[PDB]
Nucleic acid binder design. Structure first.
Lengths: 143, 201, 136, 63, 70, 141
RNA sequence: AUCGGUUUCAAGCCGAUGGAAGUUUGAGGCAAUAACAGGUCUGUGAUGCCCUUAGACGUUCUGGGCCGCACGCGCGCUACACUGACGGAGCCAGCGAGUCUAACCUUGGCCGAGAGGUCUUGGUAAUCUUGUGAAACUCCGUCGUGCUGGGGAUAGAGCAUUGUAAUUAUUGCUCUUCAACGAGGAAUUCCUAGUAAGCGCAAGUCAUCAGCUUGCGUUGAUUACGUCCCUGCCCUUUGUACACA
C-alpha cells in the first residue's frame, strides 16, 4: 500500500515506464536519433533505434529520482562504458552529452525533472506522482 | 508450511527454505549415497548450502579443501583457461544451468549424478617419471582433484568453437561419466592413464 | 516462396543470407555504421535476411547509398568531404574506393610529396617505427 | 572386476627423485590382519582407503 | 547457404512434429538437428512456448532450457 | 524508549550498517526490499541469515541496511553479516542471552563469515612485479 | 594462550579448542664482515689527471637526427571468440593529486553525433572536483560455429585540442579501407591465498603524448603443504698438480 520507485525491480520498472512514455507522444525526440550511438566510445547505434529514448528518458527519470540532484556530466560518466582503443588497453570514455542533455530538457518540458538549486536537476512533485503510479501498476499487473 | 507475513512481503518459495531444508533452491542433500567407498570423507554432501559460492578459506593448511562442498569445487575448476579467471558469478550461473539441464534429461537429483561422475572419472592408478615410468596408486584427494580437472577441462574443450554452450557440454560429460560411457573426455581419458599404469603395474 | 541467394548489387555479389545490415557492408566502400544508417533512411525491416527485400526497396537502398546527402545523411558520415578536386562531400561506395585510393597516391607521387614517395617505396607512411615491425 | 579397498595404518616419508610418491603401509579392509607396503602419488593422511587392482606385489623405494 | 540454416514456412511443419518427444530442448539441440541456425532457433523456442508444447524450467538469456509438454 | 541497536558487518572494504529496531518485518537495503539485490544468485547469500533461524524470529523487528564501499559481492557478504550480527545483538540486549546463545550456535553451525569478518586483506604491490608476488619476466639471453 | 599428544618428557614440534588474529599473525623498512679492478666522471660549483679555450669541445640561434629499415633478439599490448561480440539497461571501489600574480582539479547550465567548445562555479582542499556513481561484472535482447558481426592492422578523406611550430602523420574524434592471427616448434618465465589470474583506477615524467613504471582496489581459482632429479645455496668431512682459484 506504500509502493514507491524503490519497492519495484530496476529493469521490470524501466520497461513499463518505457511503454507509458511511448504511449504518450509527450516526450520529444531530438531529430538526430537513428544517427547516434550514445557515446564517443562505442561500435554501433542502439540496436532498437525505435526511440530507445523512452528507455534513456525512463532511466534518467529513475536515476534523478533515487539521487539528490544529477548533472549531465554525472549521466555521461555513468552511461559511458569501456572503449576498445584497438590494440591498446581499454579505457573509460564517458557517454555522449547531447543525448543526456536533450532527454533532461524533454523531461523538463513534460514535468518529470525540475532544474534544481546547487546546480543539476531534482524530480518535480508531478514527477514523483507519475513514477509512483507506474511503480504501483508494474507490481499489481503481475499480482 | 507456515506461510508467515512481514512488512517486506517475501515470496512463498523463499519462505519454504526456512529450516525446511537447504537446497540450491530445488536440489536436495538428503542423499542418494556416494555408494563408492574410499571417496566418502573426501566428497562433502553432508553440509547443505544455497549457492555454489562461499568466501572460503579452503586453501589454508593442507586437507581443508576436502571439507569444501564438491559443487563449489566444480564451480571453482570451471574458471580456468584464463579469460574466465575469477568470475565465479558466471561459473555458478553455468553450474545452476547444467544441474537443471542434467535434471530435465536423466533427472536422478542432479547432485548424486555429479558425485557419481567424480567417483567414475577418478584415475585410481597412475605412473611417475623415475626416461622410465613406475606405476603407483593414487591418494583419494588427488582422485577427486583429477576427476574434477578431467570433467571441467573436457567440458570447455568440447564447448570451444561450437554452438553447444559450456552448460550443455559439462552436463553431457557429467551424465556419460556417471553412467560409464567412455564418450565425454572422461572414462576414456582415465583409462588412458590406467593403461600406461598396467604396462608397469 | 521467392527467397533469392546471390543478390548482385552495384558490381558486387552480396549473398541474400543471414542479415541485410551486414550483407550491404560486403560492398567495398560501405561499413556496418553506414549500411545501418542507409537501411534506416530506406525504411527497410532489419530482422529480414537480406534476400526477402523486393527489388523496388533494393533500388532505394542503392539510391540512398549512391546519393546520401539528399536523404538526411549529415555529411560527417562520408569518405571524401571537402574533396581536393571541387570541394563537394560524397561517398565512394563502388569500385571507386580503390579508384580514388589510387588517384590520391598518384596525385601525391605526381607532386613528389614525402607521403607519396613512401607510398611508392611501399614503406609505412604514418611515421611509424618500421625497424622492428612490418617484416613480411 | 575385483578391485581391493585397503585403509592406510601409517605413512613412511616420501620416495622418488622429488617427494612426488609417499611410501605408506595399508591394512586390507577385506580379510584384515594382512598388512602390505604400497606407493601413492597425491597427498595421504591416515585412515584413507586406496583401491588396489593387484593385492599381490609389494612396494620398494624409487631411487 | 550455411549447412541448412535457411528461412522457411514448411520447416515450421518439420519443427512442430520433430521438437516434441525431446527430453531436452534448447538453441544447441535445435541447431544440432541440422535445422534453423541460432536466430531462427530462438524465435522457434519462443513460439513453441506460446503454443504450449514446451514447458520452460529456466529462461535465462544466452542459455534457455525447455522440456516436452506433460 | 524503543528497542533499537545500530550494528555493522563488513567483507573486504564493504561497510554495511544495519539498524534493527522493534517493528513488524521491514527488512530493507538502500531504501529497497532485500528481494532486489544487484546479483540475483547472491539473493540467497543476503537471505540465508533469515532462512537459518526462521522468519518467525523477524515477525517483530525492522532492519535498514546502508551499504558503502567494495564491489557487488563484497556488499552482499557485508549485508548478510550486518543482518546476522544486528539480529544477535538485538536478541542479546532485548530478549536474553539464552535465545542469543540459541541463534549464535544456529548461525555458526552452518559455516560463517556471517558473525566476524574474514581477516584476509590485500597484500601491497612491491617493485619488479604486477602484484604482491607475480614478478616480471626474466631475460637471461 | 588452554588441553591432548609427542623428543633422554630439554629446546621444540604436531593436533584440537577458544579467539579479530595461532606461518616471525600478513607485508615491507632497516640490514654484518669481506669483496667486485660490477654501474655511474651523462645527477651533482663530487673530483685527480689529460684535451680544448673563440674559426670553441663553452652556451645561444635556424633547421635536421635520436623514430632512419634486407634482418635478429628482450619486456609488453591486442587477439584468435558463444565462458563470446554487440546494443540497451543494471550499476559498486580503493590509494591519489589539485591554482595568486598564477591558469591547476574544474562542478553546473547551454552549443555539438563527435572529439571538443562557450558563460559561470566550488576548492590552497576529510569542506569542491568526488560517492572520482572505474572496468571487468549483472540482467534482457540482437549475432549463430563463417577469418564471421571474432580481430582490428594497414591505408583515404574530413573535424577538433595542445603547442612559436603537428610535415616524417603528437593526441583525440567521424566515416570508409579491411591484413595476419583458427591457441603457437625447439625452448624459456613467474607463481602457494585475498596470493596466481582477469578487470580497471590514481600517481611519476606531462603543454600535448602510456601499449611503461610506482601504487590501489574490483572479481577471485586450480594445485603443493613436499624433495634434492635439474639449477643453485649454507655447514661439516674428504681429494687436489687450482689460487686473475
Amino acid at each position: 500500500p506504500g509502493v514507491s520507485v524503490r519497492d519495484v525491480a530496476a529493469q521490470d520498472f524501466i520497461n513499463a515506464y518505457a511503454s507509458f512514455l511511448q504511449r504518450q507522444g509527450k516526450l520529444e525526440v531530438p531529430g538526430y536519433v537513428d544517427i547516434v550511438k550514445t557515446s564517443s566510445g562505442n561500435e554501433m547505434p542502439p540496436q532498437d533505434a525505435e526511440g530507445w529514448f523512452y528507455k534513456r528518458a525512463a532511466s534518467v527519470a529513475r536515476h534523478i529520482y533515487m539521487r539528490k540532484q544529477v548533472g549531465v556530466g554525472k549521466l555521461n560518466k555513468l552511461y559511458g562504458g569501456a572503449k576498445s582503443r584497438g590494440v591498446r588497453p581499454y579505457k573509460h570514455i564517458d557517454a555522449s552529452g547531447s543525448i543526456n542533455r536533450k532527454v533532461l530538457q524533454a523531461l523538463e518540458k513534460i514535468g518529470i525533472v525540475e532544474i534544481s538549486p546547487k546546480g543539476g536537476r531534482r524530480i518535480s512533485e508531478n514527477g514523483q506522482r507519475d513514477l509512483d503510479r507506474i511503480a504501483a501498476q508494474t507490481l499489481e499487473e503481475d499480482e | 508450511f507456515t506461510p508467515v507475513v512481514l512488512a517486506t512481503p517475501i515470496p512463498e518459495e523463499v519462505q519454504q527454505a526456512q529450516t525446511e531444508i537447504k537446497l540450491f533452491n530445488k536440489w536436495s542433500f538428503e542423499e542418494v549415497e556416494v555408494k563408492d567407498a574410499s571417496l566418502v570423507d573426501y566428497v562433502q554432501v553432508r553440509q547443505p548450502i544455497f549457492v555454489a559460492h562461499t568466501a572460503g578459506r579452503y586453501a589454508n593448511k593442507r586437507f581443508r579443501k576436502a571439507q569444501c562442498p564438491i559443487i563449489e569445487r566444480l564451480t571453482n575448476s570451471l574458471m580456468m583457461n584464463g579469460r574466465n579467471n575469477g568470475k565465479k558469478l558466471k561459473a555458478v550461473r553455468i553450474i545452476k544451468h547444467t544441474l537443471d539441464i542434467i535434471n530435465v534429461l536423466t533427472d536422478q537429483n542432479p547432485i548424486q549424478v555429479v558425485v557419481d561422475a567424480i567417483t567414475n572419472t577418478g584415475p585410481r592408478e597412475d605412473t611417475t617419471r623415475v626416461a622410465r615410468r613406475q606405476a603407483v596408486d593414487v591418494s583419494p584427494l588427488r582422485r577427486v582433484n583429477q576427476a574434477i580437472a578431467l570433467l571441467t577441462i573436457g567440458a570447455r574443450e568440447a564447448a570451444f568453437r561450437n554452438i553447444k554452450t559450456i552448460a550443455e557440454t559439462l552436463a553431457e560429460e557429467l551424465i556419460n561419466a556417471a553412467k560409464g560411457s567412455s564418450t565425454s573426455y572422461a572414462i576414456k581419458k582415465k583409462d588412458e592413464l590406467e593403461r600406461v599404469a598396467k604396462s608397469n603395474r | 516462396g521467392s527467397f533469392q541467394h546471390i543478390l548482385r548489387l552495384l558490381n558486387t555479389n552480396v549473398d541474400g543470407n543471414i542479415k541485410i545490415v551486414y550483407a550491404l557492408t560486403t560492398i567495398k566502400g560501405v561499413g556496418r555504421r553506414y549500411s545501418n544508417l542507409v537501411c534506416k533512411k530506406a525504411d527497410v525491416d532489419l530482422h529480414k535476411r537480406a534476400g526477402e527485400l523486393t527489388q523496388e526497396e533494393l533500388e532505394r537502398i542503392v539510391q540512398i547509398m549512391q546519393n546520401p546527402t539528399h536523404y538526411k545523411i549529415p555529411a560527417w558520415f562520408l569518405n571524401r568531404q571537402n574533396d581536393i578536386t571541387d570541394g563537394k562531400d560524397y561517398h565512394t561506395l563502388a569500385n571507386n574506393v580503390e579508384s580514388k585510393l589510387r588517384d590520391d597516391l598518384e596525385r601525391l607521387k605526381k607532386i613528389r610529396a614525402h607521403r607519396g614517395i613512401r607510398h611508392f617505396w611501399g614503406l609505412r607512411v604514418r611515421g611509424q617505427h618500421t625497424k622492428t615491425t612490418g617484416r613480411r | 572386476t575385483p578391485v581391493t579397498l585397503a585403509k592406510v595404518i601409517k605413512v613412511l616419508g616420501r620416495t622418488g627423485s622429488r617427494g612426488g610418491v609417499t611410501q605408506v603401509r595399508v591394512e586390507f579392509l577385506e580379510d584384515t590382519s594382512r598388512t602390505i607396503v604400497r606407493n601413492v602419488k597425491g597427498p595421504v593422511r591416515e585412515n584413507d582407503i586406496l583401491v588396489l587392482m593387484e593385492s599381490e606385489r609389494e612396494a620398494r623405494r624409487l631411487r | 547457404a550455411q549447412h541448412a540454416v535457411i528461412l522457411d514456412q514448411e520447416k515450421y511443419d518439420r519443427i512442430l512434429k520433430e521438437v516434441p518427444t525431446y527430453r531436452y530442448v534448447s538453441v544447441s539441440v535445435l541447431v544440432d538437428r541440422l535445422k534453423i541456425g541460432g536466430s531462427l532457433a530462438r524465435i522457434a523456442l519462443r513460439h513453441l512456448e506460446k503454443e504450449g508444447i514446451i514447458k520452460p524450467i529456466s529462461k535465462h538469456s544466452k542459455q534457455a532450457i525447455y522440456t516436452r509438454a506433460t | 524508549a524503543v528497542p533499537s541497536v545500530q550494528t555493522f558487518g563488513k567483507k573486504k572494504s564493504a561497510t554495511a550498517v544495519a539498524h534493527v529496531k522493534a517493528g513488524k518485518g521491514l527488512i530493507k537495503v538502500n531504501g529497497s526490499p532485500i528481494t532486489l539485490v544487484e546479483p540475483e544468485i547472491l539473493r540467497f547469500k543476503v537471505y540465508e541469515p533469515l532462512l537459518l533461524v526462521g522468519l518467525d524470529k523477524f515477525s517483530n523487528i525492522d532492519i535498514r541496511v546502508r551499504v558503502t564501499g567494495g564491489g557487488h559481492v563484497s556488499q552482499v557478504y557485508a549485508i548478510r553479516q550486518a543482518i546476522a550480527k544486528g539480529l544477535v545483538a538485538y536478541h542479546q540486549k532485548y530478549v536474553d542471552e539464552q535465545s542469543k546463545n540459541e541463534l549464535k550456535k544456529a548461525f555458526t553451525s552452518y559455516d560463517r563469515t556471517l558473525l566476524i569478518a574474514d581477516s584476509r586483506r590485500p597484500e601491497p604491490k612491491k617493485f619488479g612485479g604486477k602484484g604482491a608476488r607475480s614478478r616480471f619476466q626474466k631475460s637471461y639471453r
